[model samples]
Target: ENLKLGFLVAQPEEPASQTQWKFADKAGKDLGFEVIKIAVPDGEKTLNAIDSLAASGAKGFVISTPDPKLGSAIVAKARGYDMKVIAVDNQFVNAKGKPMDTVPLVMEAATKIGERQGQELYKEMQKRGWDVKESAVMAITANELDTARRRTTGSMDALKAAGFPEKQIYQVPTKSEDIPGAFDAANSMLVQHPEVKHWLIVGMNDSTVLGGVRATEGQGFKAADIIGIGINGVDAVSELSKAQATGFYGSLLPSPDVHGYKSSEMLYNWVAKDVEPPKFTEVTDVVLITRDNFKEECE
Candidate 1:
C-alpha cells in the first residue's frame, strides 16, 4: 500500500540523526511509500513541524530527535490529529508515564550500544589495572534529550552496579546537540579534571562529535587514557578500529537500520491495511561493537 509518511529528524545535517534519516528514507522507498522528510532544529520547531505535517495530510509521522521534549510534543500532536506516530531511537509517553498510543514503535538501538560500551570500558579498565577506587571519569552528553539522558544514565548505572565508585563519574552538559559542543565540553572536563586517569566519553548518537576525541588527543593524553563510545557508521567503524588497534579501548556500532525500516513499515500497515499494530514494537536491539568485536561486527 502506498502511504504518505512524514519523517521528522533533528538536524539532518548532523551525522548521527542523518544516518537514521537515510535509513528511514531507504526503508520508505523499499516499502513503496512517499516519505516527506522534515528537519526540525529542536523541541519547539518539532511541534510546529508536526502540526504542519498533520495539516498537509501526512498519513503517519516518524520522529528521531535527541530532544525528548521535541519528541514528546510530536507524539502528542500526532495523536491529536489521529495520525500514526512512530518514535525512533526513543519513546515518548504521556503525563501519566504511559507510552503514547500514537507511538506504536520505539527503536532503542543506540541505548543498547551505550550499555554494551559501558560494560566493555569497565572490563578494559579492570584488565589495564586502573585504580577504580580513586579514578575519575567524565561524560559529555548531547543536550537534555531523553535518548542522551538514557544512554548516559544507563552507562553510569552499569559502571556503578559493577562496583565502580559513584563519586568518580563526572558529567558535563552541552547546550547544543552537535560535535562542536561535545568537543568544547570534553575539553573543559579534561582541563578541570587533569588527574582523571580513565575517561569514558559517551556521544548521544554517533561519533559526530569525534572532535572531542581529537581534542583529548591533542592534550597529550595517550591512547590508553580514553575510551570513546561512537555510534555506528563506516567512518566510525574505521576510526574505532584504529583506536582499538592502538589500545584506545571503546565500542562502536552501525546505526540500527532495522528500526527505520520497521517504523516506516508499521506506519504503512496502519494507514493502508487499517491494521492495529501493537502499542509498541521493539526495533533492532543495540549491537555492541568493541575493540575485540569491531572488526567482526563493523565489517
Candidate 2:
C-alpha cells in the first residue's frame, strides 16, 4: 500500500484509550500515513503484540503503557526488529542503548496540584483556628508504574518544599491501577494510621485509583479530612466539584487530550519523515481545577 508509517497501541478498547487513538488519527491524517491500533490487555500482552506487529511488516510502532516491567520486553523486541519505536508518555530502550524517544505529558502538574491542595488544606485548618503544624497526611501510590512513582515523588517533593512536615507524610503501597486494591490499601492506612488528620490521595490517574475515595466515604470520614486526586477526565472534574463544595480543596488538571494529541503528532512526524524524535518532550502547563475554577476548566 506504500504506507509511510504504521502504529500499534496497547489497550485502545478501554474508555481511557480514546485519547491515544484520537491523537493517532489526527497525526496520521496530518502526516499522510496509515496508523494501526492493536489492543492488548496489559504490558505482557503488549510484548506479544509487538512481536506480531513487527512480523506484520510495520516499520514504526507506538506503545503507550509506561510500566517498565511491561514495556522493557516490547522495547527489546522492537530493537531486535530494527524498528523505530516511540514510547509515548513513558520511556523504553531503543537501538542506541538509550530509552526510546519520548513525548511526555505534564506529569509534574499532578504534583503541583497535590501541593496546592495540601497548602489549601493547611490554610483552611488555620482559618478554623486549628493547629495545622501538627497535621498528619497520607499519599496513595501505584508503585507498579513509573508514572505513579513520578506523581508520588512530585507531590511529596512539593509538599516538603512547602514546609509540610515529613513525618506527617505517610506513603502507602497499592496497585493504583487496581480499584479494589487501592480501596483496600487506603482502608488499611486509615486503620493503621488512625491519627492522620489530612489525607492527600494522589492518584496515578483520576480514573484508575478513585476506589480510594469510595473507601474513604465508607469509613465515614468527611471531606474535611480529605484532599483527593489531581488528574484528567470528567470524573476528576466531578470529584473536584464535590471536594470544593464540601471545602475539601481541589486537584491538578493534566490535560490528557493535549498529551495524547501531541504524542501522536510527534510519532506521526517521526514515522513519516524518518525524523529523529526527541528523547524527551515535556508538557509544561498545568491548570489547578477547583470549585472556583472548575466551570472554566471543565467546559
Candidate 3:
C-alpha cells in the first residue's frame, strides 16, 4: 500500500487546521495511506504546494485555499496529474471567482453555525436582561470568503428574526480577517459608537470573536457587559474553560477534525475503490458550546 494522499493546509499553525491535520493523519494510519502535507503560507504558494504534493507521489489531494483566485489554479494543477482533488474547508472557484461544482468538498454549514451562534448570544442577552438595555450587536465580518459572509448574514438574520432592531446591528469589516485585525476594527467601532452601553459581539470564527472580546475588555468593560459568540469554538473554548471571567462567552463548534478525516477517507475511496466523492459534504452537526459545558462539548 504505497498510495499517498496530500493535505494542503493554508494556515498550518491554526488550531482548527491542526485538528483537521490530526484527523487526516489518523485516517492515513487507519486506512493504510501515505499522507503528504504542505504548509501553504499564502495563495501564491498554493500551486507550488500542489506541484510539490504531486511530485511527492500523492495520488490524490485534500486542499484548503484562503484565496478565492487560487482555487482554479489548484484544480487545474491537480487535474494535470489526473489526481482527484477534494476541497476541505474552502471550495474551489473558477477563474471568474465563481465556485466550481465539479469538485468534492467537506465543509461546515456556515450559515447554520452562525444562526446557532446568534441564538446563543440572544439567549445570554435575555438572561442578563441586556435585551431591554441599550445594547447593540457588532458582528466582525471577513467579507472576502463565502463562508464568512454567510456566517455573518445568518447571525444577523437570526437576530432580526428574534425581533432585535435591524438598525442596532452593525458590521465591522476587518482587512486581515485574523485576531489582530478584528481587535483593531472592533476597538475603532467601540470608540466611534460610545452610545451603546452593553454590546453583543459575533464573528465568523473564534479568533474574530476573541478579538472583539479583548477589545471590549481592553476598554475596561467587564466580562458581564458584553455577550459574544464565535463560530468554531477552539480559541474561545480555551478562554472559557479557564473560569477566568472572560467576555468571550460562547461559540458554535464545527468540529473541524471531521472535515479532515472524512475528506481523507473520501479521497482514499476515490483512489482505491474507484468511488466518486460527493459534490458537497456539508457537516451540519454544530453544537453551541459555552462555559457551563465547555469541558464536555468543546474540549
Clashing pairs in 1: 232-253, 232-254
Q: Model 2 over residues 145-176: C-alpha lDDT tens digits? A: 65567677776776677666788777788854
| Tens digit of per-residue lDDT, candidate 1, span 1-299 | 44678887776776556666677789777877788888877777787777888777888877775565454666557779988876775566666565555556566544555666677668777877877754765677754466677777677777787787888888888767666777788788888887776666656654533656766887887667666665544345666656335333444553456666677777787787888678667554556665567667643
Worst 10 residues of 1 by lDDT: 243-252
RMSD of each candidate relative to the true structure: 6.3, 5.8, 4.1
Q: What is the overall TM-score of model 1 with all chains considered together?
A: 0.61
Return the top candidate by lDDT.
Answer: 3
lDDT computed for candidate 3: 0.84
In terms of TM-score, the best-performing candidate is 3
Whole-model lDDT per candidate = 0.67, 0.61, 0.84
Q: What is the TM-score of each candidate against the true structure?
A: 0.61, 0.63, 0.74
Residue 101, candidate 1: Cα error in Å is 7.3
Sort all candidates by lDDT, best to worst. 3, 1, 2
User: What are the per-model numbers of colliding residue pairs?
Assistant: 2, 1, 0
- For candidate 2, what is the TM-score? 0.63
lDDT of 3 by residue, 121-202 (tens): 8888989887444889998888888888999888888988997888899888988777899999899889988988889998
